[PDB]
Design a binder for this molecule. Structure first.
Ligand SMILES: Nc1ccn([C@@H]2O[C@H](COP(=O)(O)OP(=O)(O)OP(=O)(O)O)[C@@H](O)[C@H]2O)c(=O)n1
Ligand SMILES: Nc1ccn([C@@H]2O[C@H](COP(=O)(O)OP(=O)(O)OP(=O)(O)O)[C@@H](O)[C@H]2O)c(=O)n1
Ligand SMILES: [Mg+2]
Ligand SMILES: [Mg+2]
Lengths: 227, 221
């Protein structure tokens, strides 16, 4: 009731980064990505509690790293499962008014970004997403590699995290709101809210909140923090 | 007739990079971006000629930098005008079978990427575009910041250069062409069929200081 709780999905293994360790636990200039992501949230001064979802076998390590500044839970076999499992913790009697979902991969997210997202929830917006103008040309491509069209670019945005929701809205969306289809039902949380007719609002993202995915992303991160 | 000619738009001033010099002529670890771009094309071993379009007042400088490994032309006031002006050079009697258009900004493009694009033109594809998966989800947004919808990201790609075309197809497209962002767009406008090949993360466009930093990091070791 005024209170902001942040869910941090960090239960992925980071296939495309290929760094011997599951991505979130990769060390970058001393601090692991999970630690950086968590610090990023707390330093906004507007996050009351962090729930971090990590791989089942890394429960202890996470606790050692983060100490008292985040609750630990085991993640699932895809991002949706993980956010679902984390949502369990935020149930009944004493549920917070607001939830943030924040990718651990976006480990250089400025606290200023978190602040803006929360500011928008406090203004009455049920769902909030940080966004950036498009940098490359985007083409819709079918399954053969054939271009189906070049989407008109002005009404398009690249979306980031943390995404903010009123808890009850996010909860509905994940629960049965997943009628849908079999497994991994999306990396993007606002999608689920849209599936059930929720209205998602947009705020300025930040280039620093990019998702560390490939070695090339890692290099930019190293460059950003070593300076 | 078998031959590949590459057009390199480099006539932009690079507003968003703000480096005192027009972007293409920015030095990165000794070599300018235009030189890097050009070398990237030649080293593929499958580009026969390079046409570089630079700002009208940098014609000489370009020539000094590049020497004998690229023809120089003045560019126009936007990217389309520039590609249009460059296309003039590739006209009648002895036109090449294939054209590549390659942003000078994408200065770390691996020669392997160029080779793949050309390989696809040699396989019979009229138009070819190198692509990457998207990191961020794309959403449609109204003028107030209200999300209107989220297209299926798996049916969406981020497009790079060099883009390859059969010359006659590209020529029609520009000479029919209603900025325009992207060369394949024009081919699509007139119903041409664009094929896709794997891009490469190294072929990113240097746009902002943040892009520059990654580039510096990539070339320094
Ligand atoms: N089953 C999963 C899969 C992903 N994530 C988290 O969601 C964020 C975004 O996912 P992504 O960047 O794809 O990370 P990975 O899934 O680990 O990477 P990859 O897809 O390359 O394996 C990451 O912090 C990741 O750890 C998660 O909590 N549980
Ligand atoms: N009138 C123009 C505009 C752009 N370009 C070229 O098109 C490529 C992509 O354009 P962009 O990345 O936008 O470069 P600039 O337009 O120079 O940068 P900015 O938009 O930041 O000014 C660049 O190699 C640029 O030099 C060009 O040849 N002629
Ligand atoms: Mg994943
Ligand atoms: Mg431009």
């Amino acid at each position: 009731a005024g209170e902001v709780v942040a869910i941090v999905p960090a239960a992925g293994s980071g296939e495309r980064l290929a760094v011997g360790v599951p991505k979130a636990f990769y060390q970058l200039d001393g601090q692991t990505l999970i630690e950086r992501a968590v610090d990023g949230l707390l330093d906004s001064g507007v996050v009351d509690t962090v729930v971090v979802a990590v791989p089942a076998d890394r429960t202890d390590e996470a606790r050692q790293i983060l100490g008292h500044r985040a609750m630990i839970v085991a993640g699932g076999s895809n991002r949706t499962d993980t956010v679902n499992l984390a949502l369990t913790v935020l149930s009944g009697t004493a549920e917070p008014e607001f939830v943030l979902v924040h990718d651990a991969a976006r480990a250089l997210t400025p606290p200023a970004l978190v602040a803006r997202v929360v500011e928008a929830l406090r203004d009455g917006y049920a769902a909030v997403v940080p966004v950036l103008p498009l940098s490359d040309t985007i083409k819709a491509v079918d399954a053969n590699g054939v271009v189906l069209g070049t989407p008109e670019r002005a009404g398009l945005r690249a979306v980031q995290t943390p995404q903010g929701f009123t808890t009850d809205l996010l909860l509905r969306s994940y629960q049965r709101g997943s009628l849908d289809l079999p497994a991994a039902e999306y990396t993007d949380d606002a999608s689920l809210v849209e599936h059930i007719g929720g209205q998602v609002q947009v705020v300025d993202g930040d280039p620093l909140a990019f998702k560390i995915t490939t070695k090339l992303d890692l290099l930019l991160a190293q460059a950003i923090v070593h300076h």
